[PDB]
Amino acid sequence: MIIPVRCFTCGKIVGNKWEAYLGLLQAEYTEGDALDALGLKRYCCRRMLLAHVDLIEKLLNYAPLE
Amino acid sequence: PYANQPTVRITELTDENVKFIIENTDLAVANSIRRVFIAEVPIIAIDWVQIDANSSVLHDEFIAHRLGLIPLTSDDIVDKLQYSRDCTCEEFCPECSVEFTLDVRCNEDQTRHVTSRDLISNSPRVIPVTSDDILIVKLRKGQELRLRAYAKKGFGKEHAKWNPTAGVAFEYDPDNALRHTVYPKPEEWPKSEYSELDEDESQAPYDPNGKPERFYYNVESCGSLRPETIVLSALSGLKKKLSDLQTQLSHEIQ
Amino acid sequence: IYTDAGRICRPLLIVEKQKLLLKKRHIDQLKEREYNNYSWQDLVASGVVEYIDTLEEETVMLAMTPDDLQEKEVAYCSTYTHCEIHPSMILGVCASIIPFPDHNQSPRNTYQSAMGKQAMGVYITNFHVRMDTLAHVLYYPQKPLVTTRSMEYLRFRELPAGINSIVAIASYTGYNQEDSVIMNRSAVDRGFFRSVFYRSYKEQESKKGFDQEEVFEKPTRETCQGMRHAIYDKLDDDGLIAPGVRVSGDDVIIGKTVTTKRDCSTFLRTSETGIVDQVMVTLNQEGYKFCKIRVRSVRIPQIGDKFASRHGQKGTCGIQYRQEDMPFTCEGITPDIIINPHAIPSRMTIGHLIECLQGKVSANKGEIGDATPFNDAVNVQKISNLLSDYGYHLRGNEVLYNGFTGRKITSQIFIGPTYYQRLKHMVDDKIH
Amino acid sequence: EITPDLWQEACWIVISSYFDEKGLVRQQLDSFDEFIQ
Amino acid sequence: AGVSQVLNRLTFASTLSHLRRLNSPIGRDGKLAKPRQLHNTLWGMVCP
Amino acid sequence: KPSDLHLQTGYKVERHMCDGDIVIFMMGHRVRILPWST
Amino acid sequence: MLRSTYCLLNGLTDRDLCELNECPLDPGGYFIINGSEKVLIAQEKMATNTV
Amino acid sequence: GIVQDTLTAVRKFTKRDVFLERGEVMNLLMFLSTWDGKVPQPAILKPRPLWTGKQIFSLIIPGHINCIRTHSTHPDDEDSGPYKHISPGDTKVVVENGELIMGILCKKSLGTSAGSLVHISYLEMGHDITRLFYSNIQTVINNWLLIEGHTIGIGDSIADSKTYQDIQNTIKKAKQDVIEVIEKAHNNELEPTPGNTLRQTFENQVNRILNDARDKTGSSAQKSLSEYNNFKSMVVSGAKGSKINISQVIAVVGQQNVEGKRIPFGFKHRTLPHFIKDDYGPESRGFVENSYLAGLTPTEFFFHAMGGREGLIDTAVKTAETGYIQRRLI
Amino acid sequence: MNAPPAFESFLLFEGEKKITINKDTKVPNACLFTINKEDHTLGNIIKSQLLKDPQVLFAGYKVPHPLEHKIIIRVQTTPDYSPQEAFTNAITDLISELSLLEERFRVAIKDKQEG
Amino acid sequence: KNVTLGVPRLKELINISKKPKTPSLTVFLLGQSARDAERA
Amino acid sequence: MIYICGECHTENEIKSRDPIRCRECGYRIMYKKRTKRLVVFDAR
Amino acid sequence: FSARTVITPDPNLSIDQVGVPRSIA
Ligand SMILES: [Zn+2]
Ligand SMILES: [Zn+2]
């Protein structure tokens, strides 16, 4: 649902690079440049942002129980 | 019959990275150092969560799990904390654990990012690495998250949330002078960054009298423990495992 | 001439003489499909696309591609009357997930089509309100890094079912014997392929006869007891358990008594130790009280759980080694899954190796690769010449080191990111 | 004019426009609409 | 029998693939033909 | 049962299968107890 | 049948599909009968009226 | 049980080049259960003490077995000429006195068969001894494979440009040969071979040309597999897959048949609406001329699905019939 | 269920001794040290340091099963040297090397920080 | 000639089906008929 | 016993022997107001 | 009469052993 902390393979914290990735993609940076700007060098870490589907943004459309 | 005398040359030292080189040591010692970087350096990480209110869209164990993976700056406290199984307090005490709380509620109409800046700690020195923030959850108007947590001490052999490295590069003999890897075609292969070969040569000429020496490391940090401290704590922890084994053995021989 | 109901048909481009009628202006008007009101029907109604059915399809002379088939050459046919839009529209919904399916043998496309229906994922966005019996929800699903173009329409970027593993095809310690895989225990601790499993239990307070009314009430040692069994203490006084309590094996969920009262309480389905998620109380059609209770159980991948690629062979997890035991790269990239080499040849799934190669290029390039079947603008040579630009071996091999002894492995291991699915099976469902 | 090398993107605009209108359960829905109407 | 099955809700692809499912009968007409094979005429209209 | 737990020869104690028991799945194997669930 | 012309979810936008707690990606095409979601599998048969 | 895992590996372990060092050898001897505590003398003392794969295997082999198999790739012109007890390719196996003297092992030598060193072990040495021999092969090979590693990747499936040109020319010859046969039939120069028909004559002639093309491509591919290739590793030890699988992966998928014949004319006089009526060429009736590495064109993909569903149905009917026959016998 | 708690790969239970020595009877001057709650980290360095003694004819280790957490180290020396002393000296020389490595790393750091 | 083999033949042997699907008959010629094709 | 209306989210005290029916909303689906018995997770 | 558990491989058992969880036992 939500960006994982910690790239699964290596353990590097990618969980504070999701809003930065989105902000750098809306400022017209190709995804390969947005990922180099966040300092994600190993492809194991770049697939964590490259291939993430933000579903918590769709689950926040249904009104809470209270 | 005896100890070799290794030598360290540090190539790069940032706040998130040590690039060094160990020379004149066995490959097995250098690999056990790598292995201890990953799996036996103590660190502080949240290990007991109790959620007093969770209206979020992520269930309680989702949130406890995310909270376990937030790196807490355990630079100088891990040597002072006790393992919870060594300490005498009933469940937790300020000697074996650090208490965090979170109490966030979305009242506005924009989504509220509950980040790791909302984890407030009772002890001012071990805190999340916020000194951007790690998104714990996103909230919606009317949703709440209120929890208590306790960070204990452990190492990445127990759970990966106590692993402080975020990637240990290790490499010996860059240009293959020892033929530990046999390339079917040696020229298709990208040159390592530590090669001393010219651009036409693709592989060093075989070294028959050679053994692996000069191991190149690159120890990154997840922010928790200051990478040169990772390395010093790995050396001390390996030496302490060996000396405790030596005590048990000296007691078993007699 | 048929105007029946039930004739299966399909749209085809019209080729008058030897030129498509789909001109560049139809495409220019469809690009602006919003704020233009130019849709499919304005393309049908323009007499440029037709619906051909299976017996009208025997009088037609189809082309596969305009770019090749209706170009003057040594003539094969020069009386083409229709054209395929894209030849990969011959595949269904579950076979439009397979990447590079023209590189697998068809038993593998069939096997995967059957196993894409078992992969966990997110199955629907409002699973938070749906009290189905048996829902399985992955924590961190990922869209594939090598993806078909026919997946943009199956909404597989939005409810994806799997995670991009780093897969090494290597014989490591023998725990990947035939189809088994070796998993990283540290990745699995970091959230890899974790899952949630929800189950709902319903019960209604039926007063069918005059006497012998069933009623929700805390039985235990209240009054007029019958055959009270093990444990009845987590129920609230209305006989229903409350959300957020931890229920274990043979533990009571609904406290129903069928009145000198017998008990017909509801217990958990033979053990699972979940947490009560949601307790909804309502009335059925008859106006009787009605209760659905959903319990939640987190499922971390284990030694028995079955995982499968998109190229049709599934395997349990043989063993899980921590990160320091895994074979690493000179960058510290330990594989997430290690699979057996002796699985690949016998199954014709070169699509698995091309998916790893294209996935490595996509993770390094910062793109998402095109595995559409009949491309001809995507070779293995074109993928290799791009992999050799990010400083990797052009064929995807990589010098791995032994995680146990630190020594290089004499043969270079083929490693790269492949989309893996967590099949619905697992083992928590058999030991209870 | 004709589409010569822009085909592989023309190909997929025409398919996107199909699935924007119809969807994937169009046969079920069109059949029930015919029944009930 | 076998019409009107419970909708499969394990994945989204499982669901979408349930709502686009056909069913060749194995009654008297399944006794006379080869209904289990892929016919040439399934091209473009049934998934092979 | 603090009273019943005394054993003298001839009793049949119904113990838990342990390492070395012989089971069959038709060939037979010797049990070895391993720490996970398969 | 859900999301057909006679369902209450027929033209609803994705916002008002979420104010009813329905998934905007749910395809519809099934019946809710006694709580269960039923799919009418399409039964194939021989064509009538032809020799 | 000796699965593909430790059969490819034992063919690589017993090759003539496997020189183990002292620490690797001691590592391996830790996993021999039937080891007498004595480290054999190295094959090579100077300049570096350096054991061999055949030494550690001869330590696995039980008792004093004697056996003479013949590895899978043995040239048959070798036993006659010189080098008969020398064997430049190391293809003749001689386990003499419980001790592998020469020759690479495989499943031909380690399966259960006539000969089959494990069989001679069961006959001569006993029955628990061969249990230990199985488990020892497995453990020491698994650990040497930790040192050596085995993989399969792209580039194992790719053939040099010479072999690509060879296979392309083989396929083009088969095309034009079927084309000239078709022109014969269309001009009546084809005379029916005695017995069946003129249609069956043409059909057999074409199926012959096309199966010869597929087999020539498969062989001309497998003859180009380098020694550093892991598909060769798979096949020559017979461990995994058939060489036809690798042929299709590397050379050509070949002709697809539905019920023994080429793809049937399922539309009116054509196999798919993409072909012209009355097309007997190889493309029309199901000849897949691409490997799985080059990928199948849209019609080859469909003909392959057609012809590979027959496999899926045959599988089910055979399992049913076989269970029936077995129960009736039993 | 049958999930071993994560801490029992490194935590001795009551009565485990952390090390036992068995004389190996097939050959003279061979011992077999079974070390509980250890893995290749501590096994591989001890092995590679034993293989440095000129009076050690065999040094090897094995993890019997990966799900059990213990190693076996088999040592065999020359007759004028016991495997208990070879083991002890291996551990002492490893400790000495890591002490040297620690102080060399402190100095290298303190020079890199341009102290 | 086209003979049934494999499992169908195996089960028409395990049964004694008096009507095998392909009841062939191999005939060997004895005299000069054996070498000379015209008398065969 | 406080239940929560599944439509207007107002909590209301529905004690037994009373039909499930939200006061001031008349909705007939009610959720049961998460417990106060404390449950502990290890953040693993 | 067990809970029909899965069978995974284990190359560290003797070919005459089975590895049984402590819950089946
Ligand atoms: Zn990473
Ligand atoms: Zn109200």
PDB file of C-alpha atoms and ligand atoms in Angstrom, chain K residues 5 8 10 22-26, ligand 2:
ATOM      1  CA  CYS K   5     -23.412   3.490  12.681  1.00  0.00           C
ATOM      2  CA  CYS K   8     -23.267   8.449   9.944  1.00  0.00           C
ATOM      3  CA  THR K  10     -22.361   8.279  15.447  1.00  0.00           C
ATOM      4  CA  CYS K  22     -28.992   3.839  14.363  1.00  0.00           C
ATOM      5  CA  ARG K  23     -30.722   6.596  16.253  1.00  0.00           C
ATOM      6  CA  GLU K  24     -31.206   9.682  14.040  1.00  0.00           C
ATOM      7  CA  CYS K  25     -30.053   7.805  10.960  1.00  0.00           C
ATOM      8  CA  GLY K  26     -32.084   4.606  10.834  1.00  0.00           C
TER       9      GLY K  26
HETATM   10 ZN    ZN M   2     -28.608  10.037  12.453  1.00  0.00          ZN
END
